[PDB]
Structures are given as C-alpha cells and as structure tokens.
C-alpha cells in the first residue's frame, strides 16, 4: 500500500495499526524475509538484520495498537519494502531514502558554479527542483547545476526531490562571497 520517502542521515517512523485497540503481538521484517524486530509480552526482541543498531520501536504506543518501526541515521541502502505482521494480518510499507549534497563546495565566489548531486536507491527515476534565496526556480535530475552564482544566491536553497508522486524536501546552505 504505502510509500514513504526518507532523507539520508535522518530518522523515519513506519506505521502499523491493528484493528484491535489493545496490546497484541507483532513483528517487522524486510523483503529479503530477515526479521527486524518484534515482541514477547512487552519485551522487544531485535533480530538478525543489518538494521539492528539503528532499528527500534515505541514501547509506550503498543496499547493503542501502534507498533511503529523507527529507523535512525537512514542510509540510501535502507530503501526496501518493509512488512508488519499483526493479528495474522500483513501491512506493507515501502521506504525510499534520498540524499542531496553539494559535491565538495559550499563556500564559493561570485561568478562560480554550483553543482548538487542527488543520491537515490536502485531503480529510481527522480528529479529535483530548487529555489534560490532570490526565489529563482531551478530544475535538474541526477545533477543540478548553476553556472554563475550571484551575491544574492548566498543563503538557504530549498530543494525538492520527487519520485513519481512523493516528494522529500532538502535545505542547503550556500555561501557566495565577493
């Protein structure tokens, strides 16, 4: 069903609800079938996955029937389809993690070039639109270039990355000096 976009280095919460509004057993796993985490009573057990240290739940919410999966310090390679198994019902959440960095250049001079590169999971087909501080709207794809920065381009750029019909927004600080 659901598709969720996350940002590299940030944290996401994938949701799972039971029709029952009481505390019952549940577990999460990835598409490669490897168990992420689940429970015995209200004892949380983590599993084998490469997600181990970065995966957690929210123990306090189990009573209302929220058994969320929380994944911290997101990597691009956390992009996967995740599956929540509750009351023998299955609930599917697809995660795509994107990153957007200035190559190796945030402090530039007037007249110089800016080039941002987008990082995305396998099979993606994204595009990027940024707005400069002076409100000029710029398009790109894997790469986004500005060839001749002005003094008014110094400040926070707001860049939105879109895959099909879901978007994630970035803020990038760029210094342009004389």
């Amino acid at each position, epitope marked *: 069903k659901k*598709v969720v976009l996350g940002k590299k280095g940030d944290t996401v919460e994938l949701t799972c609800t039971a029709s029952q509004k009481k505390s019952i057993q549940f577990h999460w796993k*990835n*598409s*490669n079938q490897i168990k992420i985490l689940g429970n015995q009573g209200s004892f949380l057990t983590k599993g084998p996955s490469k997600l181990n240290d970065r995966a957690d739940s929210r123990r306090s919410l189990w009573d209302q029937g929220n058994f969320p999966l929380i994944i911290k310090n997101l990597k691009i*390679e*956390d*992009s*996967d*389809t995740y599956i929540c198994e509750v009351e023998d019902q299955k609930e599917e959440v*697809q995660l*795509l993690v994107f990153g957007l960095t200035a190559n190796s250049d945030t402090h530039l001079l007037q007249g110089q070039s800016l080039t941002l590169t987008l990082e995305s*999971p*396998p*099979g*993606s*087909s*994204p*595009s*990027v*639109q940024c707005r400069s501080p002076r409100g000029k709207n710029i*398009q*790109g*794809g*894997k790469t986004l270039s500005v060839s001749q920065l002005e003094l008014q381009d110094s400040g926070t750029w707001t860049c939105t990355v*879109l*895959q*099909n*019909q*879901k978007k994630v927004e970035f803020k990038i600080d760029i210094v342009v000096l004389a």
Partner: antibody
Amino acid sequence: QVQLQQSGPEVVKPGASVKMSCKASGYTFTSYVIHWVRQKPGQGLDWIGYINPYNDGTDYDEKFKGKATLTSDTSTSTAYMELSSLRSEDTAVYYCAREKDNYATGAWFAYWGQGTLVTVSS
Amino acid sequence: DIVMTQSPDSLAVSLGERVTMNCKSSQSLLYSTNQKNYLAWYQQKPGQSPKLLIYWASTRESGVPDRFSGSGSGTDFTLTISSVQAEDVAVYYCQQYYSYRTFGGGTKLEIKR
C-alpha cells in the same frame, strides 16, 4: 491495454530542431515515468532520459544534456521530445517507453512506442 | 554511467541447439539490501520495437517461452535459449536499471539450417 503511439517520420535540416510526440493510453498518464531511447540505423539502443509526467520533472543522460528537451501534456496524455541543433549523425529511430511500475519497483521498460524515424538532411 | 558490454556481437546457431549470450556491467547490479539484480533483457526483431523478455536478471516476462532463461549475478549475466527456434532471429539487448538506465550494445542471433 497500455499503448504508446508515436508521431510520424520527419526530415529535418542540419542545424534545425525537431519535435516529436508519444501518445499514451490505457493507464493513468501521471502514474509512471516515460523514457526515451535513440537507435541509429543498424546500431544499438542509447538511453536519452525521462520525464515524470506528474510535474514534468526531467533527467537526461550525460550524452544528451542540451541536445534533448522533454515535456508532457497531461490533458492529452502525451509526451514530447524536442531535439535541437541536429546534425547528420543524429539520423535515427527514437522510441518512448514506459516503466513497468513506479517507486523503483518496475524500473525496466515494459511498454514501447513503435518509434519515429528522424532523418537529418537539407 | 554504468557501462554494459555484450558479447559476442553476433552468433550463428543451428535450429534446436542451445545459445548463450553474455552481458557484463562495469559495476555490480546486485542490490545488497533486497538481493535483487537490476538487470533486464529485451528482444528486438527486425523492423520492431524492443520487447521485454526478462527482468530481475531471471524472471521471465508473462508470455515469453521458457526456452528463454536468464542467470548470473553482480557484474556478469547470461541469456540462454535452451533450444533455438526459427522465430528467435533477432538482436538481444541487456539493460541495467540499477542506477539510471543503460543498454549493452546487442547480440545479433542468426540461424543455421
């Protein structure tokens, strides 16, 4: 059944521009990415780039940046490719193709147009 | 871009024999996370558009005869035709969709009779 119907063959002069179309049907236009691909006569397939019809966002292979421009019309369910500053070596069949699925779950080209042959000559 | 290399460029095979076509990428197409290879094969018969045969390296598209099979992993892949039929004359392309999209240069299949 999904179909991609491309415009007819065209001659175009060395140095000018051509604009061709790809009409999609049998599915919701803004749901899937459309790609374009070049095939020079007797040669292989060169991926050009793609358009996300949802917001007309775009991406181009290195080789085609500045050479091609992709747009789409949501109401008529049609994607366009324009090629500019054409030279003799640009003579080719150009295909549009649709990804099988979205959100990286069907990234291969499951549906193809029949191609548009563009000849570059004065 | 990832570079896709096919070999040989062309192949002649007697009706009914087995055919193997190789595709090599400049970098791994195996996604460690889901263990899937982001690789497809297409068939392009003379005069026609390419047609999808195989995706995820080895899943046969619906309607494709099971004489067509894919294999390989990481950076090296094979398309096999277990017993070539007359209708199989075509050029075969592999395509990676791991990071953007790139096609190999094709293998043309000819038939001996």
